RNA sequence: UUUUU
RNA sequence: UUUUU
RNA sequence: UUUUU
RNA sequence: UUUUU
RNA sequence: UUUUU
């Protein structure tokens, strides 16, 4: 039984049997390649950085986030290690050109981020600061403790459960508001009334029916 | 691969 | 169009068939992303997009069981619901259509997944009414003889 | 009369940059996905989704 | 699988494998070295205290 | 027309000293991080974050 | 129906 | 739209 | 029946 | 889907 | 992120 419309089959078996895309490629929880390219171009243009030294900046940005989150409200600057020196880059180009969200843009870095955290966990205890905030008590799950982790079909069940619990504990009961204060401030009506030297007051023209005694 | 240093207000804005 | 239908069925097996899905859905052309707007898919679907895509249920199950032969392929809906059994990966999409041939364990798993996904979502029959004007039209006239824009005379007022 | 083309144009501009119409900014709309619906001459039809309506 | 933009890889493996900063150096919950230096200079100038004490 | 450069200038002055524009002081804004957005001629665009808006 | 700058 | 000193 | 993104 | 700083 | 006197 296969879908039909006016007797003709709707699907295509020959293409379907050969259609094997990567799950993360068609996933809804990750920015499209077009949006990733647009964000990358916008960041590169804003930083006034050429193609040769932008990957280093991307290396630093991925690390910074693995630690301090990818919220939409992050502002200020993010820092990079140049030896023993701090290099500060403004965070406005990173979060303002990220569509649909910075988390979905940084989900592209998930595999490399996990590999980097497992590699740093070989020469020193390296739990990402997000894993410290969520009070994760297992170091072995340090490669999975960042907020832009992208759960795939290869993620182990224990890691998936830990990530889900971390997300639930971090989000809590945050109510989503669709609107804020409306930008229309004027709630009154424009006073088109005239003012003349004949008036008895700035608020009244005459005192017509008033009778004195 | 040196780490670049950007300016506060780039002329390309 | 059948190729597009092939891509649409896969996209959904993964990212759900809610009435609120918007934006674009993607198709693999080799290594390239082809983005199609989601408005025609969800706006012309009656009664719901889930009931339209329920026609694809058997082929979707067959496709997931076939992808589960060369790599671990759990649909993203099964990952969101935190399903701990890979063998029930052919049954872990939201537009699955339970039939009399679905095994009891699969039926129970699908029912539990649906219950956990729907939670206690209250159904609202209405939203904010479109009638905005809550006042009455002011048909009163305004004349140069008026003592104020809001009043015509001060009739019974007595000064001392 | 321009409502359908306006919605299509806003969804198309929302593919290469964040393009929320200024009317949507004035009303302080907090969802970008509803940017195709945030102009004052929008014409609600039977195909407009419930959330957009 | 590594991030890509127009086919070219976005990251830099050679620098990444040698990039091992201290966690407290890139942490968001601690003032940057520039801000610490500015605060230290401001406090020193306000107190009218030399570098020795 | 000066809005983008004004925001950049206030964020740059906020790197060597606490610089809240006097308009932000009059309105009694309690967050310093929103100091780049606290002038009366600010021009809200589609890239302005929701909290700033 | 209008009134949304 | 204006009205934010 | 709908509500599972 | 978003909301995890 | 802030809010711990």
From TrEMBL, chain C:
Residues of the whole record sequence present: 108 to 267 of 267
Record protein name field: Genome polyprotein
Keywords: Capsid protein, Virion
Record family assignment: Belongs to the potyviridae genome polyprotein family.
Localization in the cell: Virion
Cellular component terms per the entry's GO annotation: viral capsid
Task of the protein: Involved in aphid transmission, cell-to-cell and systemis movement, encapsidation of the viral RNA and in the regulation of viral RNA amplification.
Principal location: virion
